[PDB]
Amino acid sequence: SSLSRFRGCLAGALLGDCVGSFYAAHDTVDLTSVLRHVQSLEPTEALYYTDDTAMARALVQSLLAKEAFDEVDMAHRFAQEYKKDPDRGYGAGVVTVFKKLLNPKCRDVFEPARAQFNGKGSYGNGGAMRVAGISLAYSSVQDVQKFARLSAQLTHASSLGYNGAILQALAVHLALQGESSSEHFLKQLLGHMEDLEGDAQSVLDARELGMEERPYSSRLKKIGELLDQASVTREEVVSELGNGIAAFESVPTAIYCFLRCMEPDPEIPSAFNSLQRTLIYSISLGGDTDTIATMAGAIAGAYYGMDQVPESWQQSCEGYEETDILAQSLHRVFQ
Ligand SMILES: NC(=O)c1ccc[n+]([C@H]2O[C@H](COP(=O)([O-])OP(=O)(O)OC[C@H]3O[C@@H](n4cnc5c(N)ncnc54)[C@H](O)[C@@H]3O)[C@@H](O)[C@H]2O)c1
Ligand SMILES: [Mg+2]
Ligand SMILES: [Mg+2]
């Protein structure tokens, strides 16, 4: 059901953040060691969430409070959540946005993000790490892109930053539509990114800024190559897609993890379901594990639904009940 997919999406995102952060802090990022310690996930709420979930919650609470996108409300919810708990693991640059939004003199909630990094904007993955709720609030693809972009621009004004958020939101949107081949899923995403990155003002800006042409489209094409490739190794995935804090080096990677893990992996025991396998695999890539896993888990959770959210894993996660209530509320309000 759509309710099951809404609940699965937000639970999967929470699992990716909580389980990913557990392994990141224990310096356990290779597959054998992840599998060795799955018992630590208790197969009380022992796994803390990070800034990924803190911002995801604030984004969803803003949409529910206004039953619409309100940039002032959402920006203030982000800044107030930072002020309440600044120690969740926020990016070093984005804290400047929050501090500016907390200034009473601030008159334009989008200006701080535009001023980041000498006026070029952040390219980090923070706009995408929190975006899944957009695709629960907005069922139409045009609205998904519109509000993924706007919500990301509150902190991430560069096209790499906000187009990464759009791509992640589109992947969650597509996953909510149910069963698909990997090929069809990837082709749909590629078609949307080609439209967005082929736009005249966009490819001109990529020219004057020295960037490469159609960056996300190129990486989605690389994903299709990897999905057809024999004996793909972690080193090839990381070398070709990245595992970094930049949206460009993490959003495609998360999507690859979802697509690859739609099929069994001989290196991951078959006792794990498809959502679990996706999370385990994503964490084994290392790098920015909490954000790659939160994004892969949001897509996988929307796709597989609550039936694949293991109670023992879910109940180990800080705030899993509030996360589930928010998912059900989004369904009641917007569906
Ligand atoms: N293991 C990790 O990498 C790790 C662990 C905890 C938290 N984080 C945090 O870092 C990631 C990104 O967060 P965010 O995008 O909200 O924070 P952000 O401050 O907007 O960007 C994060 C970092 O990327 C760099 N950066 C981004 N844009 C530019 C630019 N235009 N020029 C030069 N450098 C730039 C810079 O080092 C900045 O601090 C998230 O995963 C967040 O959780 C990362
Ligand atoms: Mg984090
Ligand atoms: Mg992170």
Numbering used by the authors: 18 to 60, 70 to 361
Question: What are the paper's exact sentences on this?
Answer:
Therefore, we chose to crystallise the hARH3 E41A substrate complexes as this prevents substrate cleavage during crystal formation, while retaining a functionally relevant magnesium coordination. Our structural data further reveal that in the α-NAD+ complex Glu41 would be displaced from the axial MgII position by the nicotinamide moiety, thus forcing the observed open conformation. Within the hARH3:α-NAD+ complex, the interaction between nicotinamide and MgII is sterically dominated by the binding of the ADPr moiety within the active site. The positive charge at the N1 nitrogen and long MgII-ring atom distances (3.4–4.1 Å) suggest that the arene cannot act like a chelant to displace MgII from the protein coordination. However, the nicotinamide moiety sterically prevents occupation of the axial ligand position of MgII, thus creating a free valence at the Mg2+ ion and forcing the Glu41-flap to open. In addition, the nicotinamide positioning is distinctly asymmetric, reminiscent of ring slippage, which may polarise the π electron system and weaken the N-glycosidic bond. Noteworthy, neither the H2BS7mar nor the α-NAD+ complex have a water ligand at MgII, thus excluding the ion as a water activator during the reaction cycle. The relative distance between magnesium ion and nicotinamide in our structure suggests that rather than engaging in metal coordination, the ligand displacement leads to a free valence and a high energy magnesium state. Together with slippage-like positioning of the nicotinamide ring, which introduced polarisation into the π electron system, it likely provides the energy for bond cleavage.
Poly(ADP-ribose)glycohydrolase (PARG) and (ADP-ribosyl)hydrolase 3 (ARH3) are the main hydrolases of serine PAR- and MARylation, respectively, thus playing a pivotal role in signal silencing following DNA damage. ARH3 is the only known enzyme to reverse serine MARylation and is consequently responsible for the regulation of hundreds of ADP-ribosylated proteins following DNA damage. In contrast to PARG, the active site of ARH3 contains a catalytic binuclear magnesium centre. To understand the impact of the ARH3:substrate interaction on reaction efficiency, we crystallised ARH3 in complex with the chemically synthesised substrates: histone H2B peptide (aa 1–11) MARylated on Ser7 (H2BS7mar), dimeric ADP-ribose (dimer) and α-NAD+.
